[PDB]
Amino acid sequence: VSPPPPIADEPLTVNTGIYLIECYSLDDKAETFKVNAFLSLSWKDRRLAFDPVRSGVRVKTYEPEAIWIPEIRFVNVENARDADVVDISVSPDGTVQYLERFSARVLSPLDFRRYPFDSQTLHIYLIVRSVDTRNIVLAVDLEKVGKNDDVFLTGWDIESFTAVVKPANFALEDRLESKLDYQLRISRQYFSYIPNIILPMLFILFISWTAFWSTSYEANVTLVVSTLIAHIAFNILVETNLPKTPYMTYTGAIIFMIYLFYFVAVIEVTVQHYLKVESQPARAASITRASRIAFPVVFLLANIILAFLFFGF
Amino acid sequence: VSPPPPIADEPLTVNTGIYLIECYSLDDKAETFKVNAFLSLSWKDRRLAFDPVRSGVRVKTYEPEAIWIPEIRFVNVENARDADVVDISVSPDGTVQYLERFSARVLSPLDFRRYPFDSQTLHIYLIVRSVDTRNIVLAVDLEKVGKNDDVFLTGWDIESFTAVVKPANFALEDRLESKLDYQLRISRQYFSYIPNIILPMLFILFISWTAFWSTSYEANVTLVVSTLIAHIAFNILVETNLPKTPYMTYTGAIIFMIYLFYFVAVIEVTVQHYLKVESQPARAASITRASRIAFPVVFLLANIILAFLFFGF
Amino acid sequence: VSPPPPIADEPLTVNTGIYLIECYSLDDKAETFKVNAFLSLSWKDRRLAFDPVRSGVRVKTYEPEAIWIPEIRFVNVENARDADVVDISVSPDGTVQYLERFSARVLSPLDFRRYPFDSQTLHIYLIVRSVDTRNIVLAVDLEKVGKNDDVFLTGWDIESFTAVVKPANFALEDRLESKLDYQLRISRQYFSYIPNIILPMLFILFISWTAFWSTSYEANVTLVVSTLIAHIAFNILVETNLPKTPYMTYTGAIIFMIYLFYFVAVIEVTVQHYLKVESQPARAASITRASRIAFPVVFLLANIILAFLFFGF
Amino acid sequence: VSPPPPIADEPLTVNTGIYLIECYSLDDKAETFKVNAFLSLSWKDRRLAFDPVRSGVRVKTYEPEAIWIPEIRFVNVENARDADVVDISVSPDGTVQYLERFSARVLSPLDFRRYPFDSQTLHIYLIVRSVDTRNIVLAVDLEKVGKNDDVFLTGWDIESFTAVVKPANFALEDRLESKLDYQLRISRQYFSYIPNIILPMLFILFISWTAFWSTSYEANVTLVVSTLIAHIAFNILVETNLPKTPYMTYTGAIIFMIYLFYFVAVIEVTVQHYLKVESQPARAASITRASRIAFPVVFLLANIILAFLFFGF
Amino acid sequence: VSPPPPIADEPLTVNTGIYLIECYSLDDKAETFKVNAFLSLSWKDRRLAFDPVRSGVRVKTYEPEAIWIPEIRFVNVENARDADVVDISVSPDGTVQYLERFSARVLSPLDFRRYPFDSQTLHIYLIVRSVDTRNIVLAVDLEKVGKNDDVFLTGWDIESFTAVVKPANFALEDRLESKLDYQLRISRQYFSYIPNIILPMLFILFISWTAFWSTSYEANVTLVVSTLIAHIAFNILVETNLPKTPYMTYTGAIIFMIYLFYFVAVIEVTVQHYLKVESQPARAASITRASRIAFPVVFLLANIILAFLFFGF
């Protein structure tokens, strides 16, 4: 139970990789998801006398966990990973293929700035426990990293898992911490939201806009205010799906725009009624005719501007 | 505590089966349910010297857990199953009937594509721990698999449990993993939903449709918009029972159809009022008479089309 | 730590009883409640040499838990009961009075078919661990079963605890399992629900019924539809108290009846307006006068029929 | 590890007291709160040879937990208290001052019968573990009981903690159980509820009452029914703060009174409209003038009666 | 495992400091947040013979946890901190640099008196375990206290962590307890709340205020009451973001002011209608013209007064 002696006086290259098995239950509210995968490391200790016999009659040698194993810890996870050791084998004067089955509650933030069509990346970092004087450096093994076993999570389509970048950070000016980064690139399927969150609100707004084709003040007032109440009720209904973040959101500005449009519609209706009362029917009709075309065009232009602001640039 | 020597050089056939005892609390939101059942395996080790005495005076021999027992693990469950060993007996040069009482929080997905009348299947897979060189293959024992002990869960009617299929999958190109599949086929009782989720919404829509039999613009506007608000409030009320999935749902399209019908009704009322104002009473009456028959017929045809789309084909 | 030898070759009669101490927190949604009580068994082993000295100078002998104690397990509970041994004493060639203080989360179903005035029964079953060949049969000791220590739970009034029935069931055609049943008969106090769930809804319906004493179509429409919206809002407000079950409920049919009455009222108002427009004032007045008396009488008759259906028969 | 011999043949007086340190998070819904305090017992064993040396050179003697310590258990708490032993010292032929730091989730019921201005008392009972034949009786030590260390909990003002009563109860006719009662007397601060739960509802009711100063039937109907809907919505809004109990509540009857007032207002408006239609303007005006004064006076009288009923008597 | 002998007869100065690493998930409702940081103490024991060899060939000496380590406990946290020892080294006749990686659920109250623009301070206290007679006094080490490693939490901007004050409190008149205070000064970003909680309510109120520019009593009543209902619905919608405290809140008085304004608007509309009915059109017009200017000016003045009350003074 000791690190191999530094005869070469060089850090041991503990190559590692993760083969995803089954991931599910991505909770947006808690920013948590489950991960089940393989952990395959290939740390080599030839000078530790870990059976470097060089005997062909005893190839594929098997050893228990009595020898020291480089401990790997996940910074993201808040609980200890349930480890299940599978294979502990070393070749004659070769490397050790030590595999494990693990499940953990890995933590990762989310970016709800493009909520209907967002493209978050899922992060997993791991660290090594540097003990004694033998430096331990983590490398990337491209052979045993991937997810090609038909894994799926509802609402998303996986596209990449082999980012395998190594952003060696710093902490209290420490010597070295590799902190291998495993990026799980995912995208959201948006077809279930168009007829659920967007179209019902647009229909309510369009129902509101019909007040310009009438001349009854009571009917216009009832239409507009009851439509506003219906919009508030729908916003209450779809509160769970909508995200609540302390920053601006693309889906969080359309609602404010809708409120502004309701206020402007109320002001326009009141102005029309006042002008009609003050005996200016020609001016009232001109204002109504102008508004009929001004409202939807302004709405479309503002939506285009907001899309170009949040997306694109 | 060693696997039996492979004198025959063949994998040991560990026959197994599950006798359901009590299952309850199927939570649709978390896709979890409780299972209490028997686990009866019949693994045979004649060459392991596990009392193959062939003595009639000592039949029905009893042994403790000192001998090795093939460990069986459930991939679905997220926690260790509470095991209660009952019988450990071997016949002279026979097999071992090792029974257990277990309770676990087995996980399984659900398909909310036909929510009022869905027919989900409940999955349970188990795996064996291949140790040393003696291959372990899992088989199906039809004698001790079933649920015929008057087990019930509220809202469902069980119909089948003996699917006992063996879909041997692959993981990292491993040698063999039987992964026996235990399918619990269930169906939902829908009579408690017709007078709770469907009829109250249809009644609200029918109340909305009565606006075509009136000529008061203010009354029509109040009727339609307040009916829309009532529909939104009812949707809020029945949110818990309705499922929220990232895919299309049969019960998730009727609501969108209802919103579309409300929008079309508002447009029709506005058109009628505008035509009446513009001194076209004959055209207004013709439009109203046409709409009176066009609305329910179109609704019925669209419902039939949606039913033929989601169900049937 | 061995069962007493079957010198008489008869099963040992382990008499037992439960003296309730403090029960509280009956959660209807989770169908769970806390129970704190005494467990007093009187299993006798005279031939086990468990101090059958027959010495008057050493009466009321005290022994530790070194001797075997018949393990008692509760099938209902999902967790191990926190056991606190109090007295372990045997009389000379007598029985052992082994008492314990236990608290457990015992599970039991509920019948929400008469929710305002329901009379559920609370079930507790226990089983014995049959070991070796000495058969163990559970009996009922009427001396130490009861709750006469001023125990109360909010909202209910206890009436019986000494049902002490023994419904010996079967499981995989086993030899014997006594499975003593302890029925806790309780009833619900309904005076806090009449002015909270029933009267506010009846008042809303009565407010709706006043539309028949008016001739303004706009006023009638506003009254009826806004009353329907208020009823929906109240149903949302009292959702937590109301039960959600996959079967028919007495309180679950009155709501459907109320929706039907709202729909019929809307139809009647529309018919009256149409007849008045079509120049049939006498027929409109006759219809209104008939409806004024027909509505409450039909409502009362339907309520009586529903009461006779759910209750009584 | 044995109780002191009863040379005097008298029960040992284990004086005890609790010095509150920090209490917080009183959850009304779960009836739970956190308590951190000191536990100082002064049980004396002179005849147990627990260092009764009577040597002045070794005063303030220190001993470890090797000697037996009378176990103290809290019936209210559902979990074991995290104990932190601080001082274990005995004077020469004196007593033992054994102090501890403990934190527990102590349970206690609440009385929501005067919710805005309630004065609940917070209960803590403790019991002793009577072992062997040496009787253990719990007493009260007024020296080390109190809370004078500037402890506060939000929304309440503590007024008393030294009730230190000893209601020795009975359980299965046991010999003796002191069951010391520690009453924490608290009161609620009500100034944050007057402008949050009471005044907004009174304002809504007053808005409703303005219908008597108008003659438009449609306006009166809209006013009253929309005000009722607003009241229901506010009740939904303040549901969390309001308590839900299976008994009558002072704040639970004002709401029913408000519903009754809404119903009576609707009836009065309908009666006025019917009388005006039936050509009785003088009677309609007289009824309106009478109601204008009858409504607020009756409301005030009923509120006074309800206050005198729930409070006072 | 003994404290160093007090040869100097002076308390040992155990200097300590916390270097923040990663803090996140500040839950306002539960007043909890996660903290991951370094714990670096520099307690010195030269007279304890903890390798005071004064040998230059063995500088940077390494020792295991066999020697006693001063236990540090956090009063705020409700759970034991997960400790990970990193470095245990002593210089020849020097001090011990004992570092640890810890994560804990530290508790701290919040002041929701300026909720949109609040400036809470986050508190962390630690205590030492005084054992034997060697007094232990906690000091502050400014070298290893800070957060300069690019740590961020959503919605807040950290500004200070090195308060490192030492408010030595008292408990039962104890000798000494340093109770070092670590203040984490944070501020809230308010730009995400202006277009989400404030502007939508101001727009609703402004929509309400348009009733003064009309003469239709029915239209005015519908406008005002439906606007009030919409305001209640919005308050329900934004309930989660708003804080619920038993004391007055800046955001908790604006709502009451809005309710008062709605009530006054209803009263004004009723007064105008009554005066118009009683044939006083000049007085009605004068009242309307006065109110048009009186309402917004009074609202602005009251808002300024409330701001000067809660903020500033």
Side-chain angles (χ1 to χ4, degrees), chain C residues 193-226:
Chain C
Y193 301 83
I194 286 183
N196 285 354
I197 312 184
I198 301 177
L199 286 201
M201 271 170 5
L202 296 199
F203 284 167
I204 289 176
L205 187 52
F206 297 157
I207 285 184
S208 157
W209 281 347
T210 66
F212 308 132
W213 275 274
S214 68
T215 52
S216 176
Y217 182 49
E218 293 85 359
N220 297 4
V221 154
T222 290
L223 196 46
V224 177
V225 191
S226 298

Side-chain angles (χ1 to χ4, degrees), chain B residues 192 207 216 223 226 233 237 241, chain C residues 218 225 229 236 239 244-246:
Chain B
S192 174
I207 285 184
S216 176
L223 196 46
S226 298
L237 172 60
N241 299 319
Chain C
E218 293 85 359
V225 191
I229 299 181
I236 295 180
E239 192 195 6
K244 304 302 211 63
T245 77

